[PDB]
From a paper:
In bacteria, two distinct G3P acyltransferases (GPATs), PlsB and PlsY, catalyse the committed step. By contrast, the recently identified membrane-integral PlsY exists exclusively and ubiquitously in bacteria, and uses an unusual acyl donor, namely the acyl-phosphate (acylP), representing a unique class of acyltransferase. PlsY acylates G3P using acylP, forming lysoPA and inorganic phosphate (Pi). The overall shape of aaPlsY resembles a funnel composed of three tilted helices (α1–3) sitting in a cup composed of seven TMHs.
Thus, the path for Pi release is blocked by lysoPA, suggesting that the lysoPA liberation is requisite for Pi release. Our structures show that lysoPA interacts with all G3P-binding residues, and forms three additional H-bonds to backbone amides of Ala40 and Thr41, and the Thr41 hydroxyl. Furthermore, its hydrocarbon tail is anchored in the hydrophobic groove as seen for 16 : 0-P binding. Therefore, lysoPA should bind to PlsY with much higher affinity than does for G3P, featuring a competitive inhibitor. The release of the product inhibitor is probably driven by high concentrations of the substrates. In addition, the exiting Pi along the Pi-release path might aid the lysoPA clearance by electro-repulsion and competing for the phosphate clamp site.
Author numbering:
A (entry chain B): 1 to 199
B (entry chain A): 1 to 29, 34 to 200
The structure:
Amino acid sequence: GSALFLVIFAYLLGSITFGEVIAKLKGVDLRNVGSGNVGATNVTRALGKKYGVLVFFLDFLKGFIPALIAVKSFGIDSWVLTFTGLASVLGHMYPVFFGFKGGKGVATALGVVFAVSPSVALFSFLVWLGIFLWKRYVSLASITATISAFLFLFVAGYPVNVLFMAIVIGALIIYRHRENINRLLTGREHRFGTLEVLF
Amino acid sequence: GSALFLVIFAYLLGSITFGEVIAKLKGVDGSGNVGATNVTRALGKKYGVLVFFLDFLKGFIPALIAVKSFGIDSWVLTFTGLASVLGHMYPVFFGFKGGKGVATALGVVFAVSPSVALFSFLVWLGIFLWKRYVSLASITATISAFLFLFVAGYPVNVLFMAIVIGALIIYRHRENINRLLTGREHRFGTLEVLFQ
Ligand SMILES: CCCCCCCCCCCCCCCC(=O)OC[C@@H](O)COP(=O)(O)O
């Protein structure tokens, strides 16, 4: 009853892909820019790093706010949190508002992890930052940090409901990156090299 | 032509009141109503959920065909979603003695607008958890559904369908409304709602 309310709320809140809303009022069509993704990385290409950080924060919140409510209400080992965090990420990937055409859910998933464990969230973000500074592919950093986020929760002793949530979310994130994976293997992925950040 | 076939099929399918047919499957016959709530009443939540899903599908299935084959702007969809609910309210297979059409109407709005449907389901859950009457939640979620379709800018064929379907549902709750105002409506326990 109460759990169903929270899970649906997490899905509806997650369905507000804020990169698509902000770019629309700024006039930009994200479909034609860079990867075509509606997420923070492509919002940065289309609108600049000022709007990319804003979109990252909002997409972060819609996974953090519902997951935190589940933790305080049902406990960290409740499967309500499992499906709440999944709902926020599935809302971002398949938004009920925009015809189920959303992003890859990396920022929203980090919001869910933050509500479960800030410690793991900051480490995974540090892992994401290093891999990115290393190779300047956001997709490679996101894939790596997604896998490291799962390994961090496991070693830290988090319950099987949290691990199940992380596996499904992580497997969904990698699957939504299959276009980036195809581009990385073929040397076509949109790098953030010298020319890209300069211009 | 083919539009009339869909409307009549929507009515006939909606006339399959599923609590009944699944109550008689397992073999049971309180409120005496044909509803998912009245099936959880009797055979447990696991069968009332299935009955809710089936009554949901008979409104969802013909309405999705209307959207896909005629368009969300078509008035074929208006009469198709109307026929499904009217089938559930006045089932030709059961002497026109049927339920209140909440689950069937939710199926109709979900095929038209998955967003409005889930938003209206949020309204129902909140009102039910807050005040603990099933009927008060169904009336409020019905009204909010039309308001959600209106402010979102859905076409006039959909707004007309929601008004007529909403009015029918509210009208089917006239006995619930009387008992609500006279304090004779059943209410769930303060703890019974959370374990519901
Ligand atoms: C299971 C929990 C996993 C948590 C996720 C890992 C944390 C990563 C740190 C946050 C990084 C900032 C947010 C970026 C969101 C985003 O935009 O993701 C899409 C990118 O990838 C690929 O971008 P693109 O080239 O446009 O497809």
